[PDB]
Amino acid sequence: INYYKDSASNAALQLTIGNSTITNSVVAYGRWPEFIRDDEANDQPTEPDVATCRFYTLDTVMWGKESKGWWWKLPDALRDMGLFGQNMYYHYLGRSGYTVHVQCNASKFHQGALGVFAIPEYCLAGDSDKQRYTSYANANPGEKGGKFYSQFNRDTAVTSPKREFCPVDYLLGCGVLLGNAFVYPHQIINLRTNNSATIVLPYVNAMAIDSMVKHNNWGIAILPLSPLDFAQESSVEIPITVTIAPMCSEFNGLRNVTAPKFQ
Amino acid sequence: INYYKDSASNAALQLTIGNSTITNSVVAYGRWPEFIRDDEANDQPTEPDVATCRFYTLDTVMWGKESKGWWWKLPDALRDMGLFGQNMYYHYLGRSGYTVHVQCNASKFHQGALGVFAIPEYCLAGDSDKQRYTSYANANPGEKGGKFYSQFNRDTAVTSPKREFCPVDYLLGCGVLLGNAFVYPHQIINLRTNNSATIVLPYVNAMAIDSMVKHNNWGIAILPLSPLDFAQESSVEIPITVTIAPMCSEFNGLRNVTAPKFQ
Amino acid sequence: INYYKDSASNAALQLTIGNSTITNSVVAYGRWPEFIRDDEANDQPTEPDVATCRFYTLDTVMWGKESKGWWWKLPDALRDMGLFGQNMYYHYLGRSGYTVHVQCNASKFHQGALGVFAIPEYCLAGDSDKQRYTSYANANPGEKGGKFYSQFNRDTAVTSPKREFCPVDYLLGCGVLLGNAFVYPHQIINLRTNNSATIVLPYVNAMAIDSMVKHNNWGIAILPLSPLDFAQESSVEIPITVTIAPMCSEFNGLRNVTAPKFQ
Amino acid sequence: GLPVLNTPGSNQYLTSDNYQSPCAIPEFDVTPPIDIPGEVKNMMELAEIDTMIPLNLENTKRNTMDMYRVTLSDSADLSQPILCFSLSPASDPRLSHTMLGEVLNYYTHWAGSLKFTFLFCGSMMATGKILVAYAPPGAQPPTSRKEAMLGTHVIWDLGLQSSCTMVVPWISNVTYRQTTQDSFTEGGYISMFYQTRIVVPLSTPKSMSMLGFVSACNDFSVRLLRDTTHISQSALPQ
Amino acid sequence: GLPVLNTPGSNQYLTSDNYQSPCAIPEFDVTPPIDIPGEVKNMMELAEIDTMIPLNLENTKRNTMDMYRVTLSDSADLSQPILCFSLSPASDPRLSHTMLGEVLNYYTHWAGSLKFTFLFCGSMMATGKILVAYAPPGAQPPTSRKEAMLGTHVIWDLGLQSSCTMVVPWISNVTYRQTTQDSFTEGGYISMFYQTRIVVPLSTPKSMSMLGFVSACNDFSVRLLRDTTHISQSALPQ
Amino acid sequence: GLPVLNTPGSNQYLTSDNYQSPCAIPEFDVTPPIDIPGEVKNMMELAEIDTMIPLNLENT
Amino acid sequence: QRRSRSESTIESFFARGACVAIIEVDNEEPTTRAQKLFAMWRITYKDTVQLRRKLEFFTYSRFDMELTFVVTANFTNTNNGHALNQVYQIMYIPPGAPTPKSWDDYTWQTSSNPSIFYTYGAAPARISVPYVGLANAYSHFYDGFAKVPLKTDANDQIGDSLYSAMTVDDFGVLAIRVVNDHNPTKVTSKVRIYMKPKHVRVWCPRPPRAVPYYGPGVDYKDNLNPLSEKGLTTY
Amino acid sequence: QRRSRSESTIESFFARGACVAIIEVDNEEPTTRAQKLFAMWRITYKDTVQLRRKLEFFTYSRFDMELTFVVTANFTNTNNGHALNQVYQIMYIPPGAPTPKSWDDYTWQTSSNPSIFYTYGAAPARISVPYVGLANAYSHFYDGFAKVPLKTDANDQIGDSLYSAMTVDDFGVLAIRVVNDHNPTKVTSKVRIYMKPKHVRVWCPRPPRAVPYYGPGVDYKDNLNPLSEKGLTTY
Ligand SMILES: CCO/N=C/c1ccc(OCC[C@@H](C)CCN2CCN(c3ccncc3)C2=O)cc1
Ligand SMILES: CCO/N=C/c1ccc(OCC[C@@H](C)CCN2CCN(c3ccncc3)C2=O)cc1
Ligand SMILES: N[C@@H](CCC(=O)N[C@@H](CS)C(=O)NCC(=O)O)C(=O)O
Ligand SMILES: N[C@@H](CCC(=O)N[C@@H](CS)C(=O)NCC(=O)O)C(=O)O
């Protein structure tokens, strides 16, 4: 029998989106993106349908024998993509899901394997003795993204510290073994079987809607699980491309435009 | 389950009154004055109908640029008004509600604002280091009332202390910020919109009936929220008048007349 | 809920009697004398009907200006009255109620007031430093009774202590203010209105029946509430008479006669 | 066994607590009671019994029989009061030691009406008229018949009736009054005056005595039991 | 007797506990209550009452009547704001000491919409138009009418109406906001600007005063009772 | 667990108390009784038996 | 509603624990001279005055009783070491039962007499007692004697008895001792007894005492001027 | 669901134990000079400011009370030995009842006054009290006097009384003593009293205090500049 009143006291193929078309997919946590429901809110939202929910292509990168990996942050990577960025900077609160498509083509005589991982609340480690001293500009590279490293290079500057991340490939840049990174939503591109990967990411956060400028909801990490090789050539390089499509995006809190200082 | 027997142990327009007529109103706490009910009493009461429930006009005051405010106490202000005062002094117990009407007229080229506040159990601060040393005579000025001040002037007399109040305008004379005085029943007279104010005060006290001589039930405070001005003249003065009508008055405990010593 | 078995543990005109006739009455505690009931006893009782239930008249006393009061004890005062005393001394256990009649006559030009009080378990104070040292003979004066005093006269004898009571009029002889003596059954004789008093006393005791020799059940106290006066004469004296009638008397425990030593 | 949690107040002794305790003499044959006259159920029953008032507390008369008597005469000043006191049942010296006052001194709050009685003990040939007045608090205590008559007053004729009774009703701002002296719970004043005078014929006493009694009515109640100041102790028995 | 087992937390005193205790005055006749005007059931009822805002907290005007007045004139710079503050009901100095702020300082979390009122105390012959704007957080605080108009703004006509009301609705990422200063729970900004200007005729004052009031709406709630910082003590009474 | 409050008299030993206590020899096969002549139910039964009186208590 | 008389009842008037006895007991090395190793107290309520005065409002009474014991101990010196927690024994001796002559005699076996063993530092001890009056009600006042002198008596002392006394030994006594042996340092202790009547019935109300008590009886010696001065015509 | 106002109720707002009194009591050998053997505290909530400020939000109130007592003891020296566990007595003296003049006078018999006996080291003591107001509600603020001077008064002191005071002695006092006798070493102790209102009703809300309290009344002496500086057009 419970005595106290409070409960706490109780003892215990082609995909077309908007005006864009790309020619199996993985759905994160088995949850498709959806709009906010009437039983959860905090004014009239602004919900663009086709002016923002479309595929945007990022800058192509090059994969060689010495490449260690790449990473991007969302919605940071799309801050300068058409009207999506304008709505992001003109509103205090934003929400959206994503569709990520990774393209990399090779021949039958090439070999290699890429692992793509989608990580919620992807926090990276610094490059100095000081803790949590990374700057906003360095933590939001944009569409260019960042790269991984095979060793921890401590910053020796004392007058003008860099205040940058120092990810480590085999620690996933956060102090966890890479082998377990498959616990996150993931895809594998093996050159002998396939040449592309697709993932669908719903909106994940402790709040229904949150600011897009000061908080990044998703991180994308691409790492070479097996080194690239071709016949018996000494040097090999192939392009890797990334495309991202926002889905079911909502904005609220219209006011003057935000102008962050990126360097 | 409760074990102990005692409950305490349990765990937790023209208005005409009498022969007087005056030509929106505010009702304090949404309660109209009423007589005592049969389910609450302690002899035959005396309940004058028209000989005491009528409008009495107090002395007019002058409002200028340097005026800081005025205050009155009820039923003290009506101690010498017709038969109401006689009944007050001929009976041990009294009860009554009030209707207060404040009149102040100006032109369209004047500007200013008056705040009128009705305060139950309005206690004022002294003017000396000694605590609660104010005299009865000084605490009951009568129909003349008192005035506010902008600073605390400590009494330096040691032989013949004045024993008087020292109200401060921005502290409401009781140590509370004036901005919150609107929590009490209140009215605002703005010269550009209206020229009069009306309030209705029911009987409020911890007891159904109480003595009128040694206890004052209500206080009236008038303060200038905005300074008075007229065109570009250096000096401006206008009259302010106050009228009070008792309502539903009861008296009990007939005996010889009381003669307080006012100086 | 009670846990323990024991309850203690539970948490909390002419009046004719016999061959005598006397020509309003007061009944003590509103209880008329009655015989013992079958539901309370401890042999065959002896219950005289007319040989003992009749009026006996005591010795007359004199009331003057300096008189302070008189007192008697019952059944002590009737120890030598006809067959009642014989039955009292021939039996171990006795029980009885009483009717007391006080007579005092004066003229219309006299003035005064007498207070008569019937006291159960009337215990009086001693006249020495020693406590409870009063003798049996002094505590049972008989039909003569005793008198009150206006001051406490300590006995200075050290060789042959008197061992007598020293009642004080204003303390009722027991350390209690006389003004409250009206809590007991009482009568007032005011010479301007009446000339006689009557009281009826039922049997009162912690036991149904008790010995009459070693225990007195009632005490009678007569005190002058107002001094006696007549015209402008210096000395005034009038007689006061007392009559007592036993009622519903029972006796038990027949054996040889008791002969107490009274001096 | 059964899980339990001890709360504040455990292992304390409160003199006013009401709990069960074990019995040291189990299986005791209690003596049955009998019907004894004079059973009392409530203490207020004692306060309803009239008792004399020591009206005269002068230096040479207090603690003496004469303190219960008030003198009256045919040659007294008719413009001066006969007696005067205050309606303080438990704190006034003339009322504190009465049975009502003794009961009240064991309680902190009281409320209700009172009954006063006056008995005239003169000769049958004496005649006169008296005025007994009660004045609620707030004004000057009465000093003359003109002021007293404005209150609650009764006129008493000695010749026709030898006793008079006046009921002081309950009138107060607070629901209960304190039993101690306090100006915020003052009760009023009681006064007496001559109406015409005492008249006597020849060969009759010219001086007489009067007595007073007080009691509580059926609408009397008390609160907040407390110890009294009328009994003290200095040394424990050895 | 009954087997029992004592658990952790026994014989401790928690100031927020709710247990039963014995009564020291059993059988007390409580005075019945009466219907007194002004009964209050919830503290939020006090937060719904409008109270003045000390908008002007300058060095020579704070702690003085003039701190409740904002000056307006017909010769003022139309390109500069009239007043500006932040939507911090409990930490902003201009809002902390209001009744809403006083109530909030006793609680740790708050949520709900707000209502602001502005009263114009000029002459009847004065005319003008004003713009009152609220901007959610995230961007630079507005410094001009062009930036302010992009937010939630209301236009007020002095001549037709002497009072204006603007409702700031609830918009936040978190369900509740802290009552202390914190950039993660920032509320926004409030600004005012001239729309056209103050226009007056001849023989009329060219300067006037304006007053401000704030209150909470019916959708306002608080959490996590806590002590306030507005009252302190240094020495206990002797 | 269940809130409780300790009252006066806790942890005291009264020789006349009547409470339950644990058994130190659980599951004991008690020997059944038999009908023995002379059973006594009340002490007063002994007071009803006549006995001689030492009437003569002289020194010798 | 209307005012009630709930708190003026007899039960409420006596629903309070009143001290009736303070008793001293010491623990130290036994010696030839007099000591306070064990104490005996005669049961009564006339040692104190407050409860006595409250009870004397009536002539006859009938009630059960609740007794509470509070024990407080202390040292006397500092250079003789310390002591361990002590255990106190309280035994009720009715009339006719043997009385102890030492702190460790056979009488403490309490084969039939009830006893309480109290451990220092625990809650105050408590017990309840029923009405144990020989008659149908207790007699606060008794106007009589226990013996009557007779003419045939050889001497006057045969029939001599105290006035207003029923029995010499009534209700027995309470014997208090310290069970523990003596430590090298003396330890003193006081036991306070508090009494509360329960299920109270009373008969024959009487006026209350007005002068200081003097002895078990109604005798008065000093302070016979209770009332104070006051003017006849003074408010 | 939607946000609720459960914790903003009057009951929740006052459902906390607030300290209202710190009282000092000492145990040592009695001497001619002044000592702290027993202490008396006048009951009120104006000694502290937090509960006073919370209650002064309203003009009239009506509630029951819960009181809790926490006792902490300590030594003062080291060369006078030690002491055994002490017992504390707390007695409530209503107006009109006799007050003690010594730590061991008859007034401690508490025949009718309620009392608490507390053993050191046990759980903090606790009691509950009902509404004991003479009127229908407590009056936090009183604008009046207890006496009115009259023209016929002989002197001006007859009608002189303090402003905003109903009764001089209200609600009685609490007397605290140490029952134990004095050990050779002095022992000091502090009793902290915590009050919690229950079943609370309030009337006539008022603005809260803005300047430091000065006396039982509404007087103010110093620190009359509460607000701080801030720019008119500064966010
Ligand atoms: C193991 C120890 O526990 N035993 C305790 C105990 C306590 C009280 C017991 O009874 C003692 C007698 C009481 C019922 C009170 C006797 N009263 C009532 C009447 N009375 C009295 C005294 C003097 N004059 C008249 C009446 C008393 O003193 C018996 C045993
Ligand atoms: C054995 C000891 O236990 N007795 C404890 C006890 C505790 C409190 C008791 O009541 C004291 C009065 C309280 C109900 C609070 C009085 N209040 C309420 C109104 N008030 C106050 C004070 C100053 N100005 C206005 C109102 C107060 O101080 C009575 C007995
Ligand atoms: N430090 C001061 C006493 C401090 C004190 O009494 N503080 C009060 C308020 S100023 C308090 O609330 N004390 C809480 C406590 O320490 O129990 C001294 O002993 O001189
Ligand atoms: N101070 C005295 C003893 C005081 C005493 O025993 N007082 C009695 C009544 S006169 C009492 O009631 N004491 C209460 C107590 O201190 O426990 C002494 O030791 O010489």
Author numbering:
A (entry chain B), B (entry chain B), C (entry chain B): 30 to 41, 83 to 93, 99 to 117, 120 to 340
D (entry chain C), E (entry chain C): 1 to 238
F (entry chain C): 1 to 60
G (entry chain A), H (entry chain A): 66 to 300
Q: Which text from the study accompanies this structure?
A:
Since PV3-SC8 has previously been shown to bind pocket factors such as GPP3 in the VP1 hydrophobic pocket, we investigated in situ if GSH binding interferes with this stabilisation mechanism by incubating a molar excess of GPP3 (VLP:compound molar ratio of 1:300) followed by GSH at 10 mM to form a ternary complex (PV3-SC8GPP3+GSH) with the PV3-SC8 VLP expressed in yeast. The cryo-EM electron potential map revealed the VP0, VP1 and VP3 capsid protein subunits of the PV3-SC8 VLP to be well ordered and there was an unambiguous feature for bound GSH in the interprotomer pocket formed between VP1 subunits from two adjacent protomers and VP3 from a single protomer; the same surface pocket shown to bind GSH in bovine enterovirus EVF330. The overall structure of the GSH-bound PV3-SC8 VLP is essentially identical to the unbound native antigenic form of PV3-SC8 VLP expressed previously in the plant, mammalian and yeast cells, with root-mean-square deviation (RMSD) in Cα atoms of 0.68, 1.39 and 0.77 Å, respectively. As expected GPP3 was observed bound within the hydrophobic pocket of VP1, in an essentially identical conformation to that previously observed for this compound bound to plant expressed PV3-SC818. This confirmed that the binding of GSH did not hinder the ability of the VP1 hydrophobic pocket to accommodate capsid-binding drugs such as GPP3, so effects at the two druggable sites, separated by some 22 Å in the capsid are likely to be additive. The GSH molecule observed bound in the VP1–VP3 surface pocket of the PV3-SC8 VLP is anchored in place by hydrogen bonds, salt-bridges and hydrophobic interactions. The carboxyl group of the GSH glycine moiety forms hydrogen bonds with two critical arginine residues; Arg257 and Arg242, contributed from neighbouring VP1 subunits of two capsid protomers. Additional hydrogen bonds are formed between Asp169 and Gln174 of VP1 with the amide and carbonyl oxygen groups of the cysteine moiety of GSH, respectively.
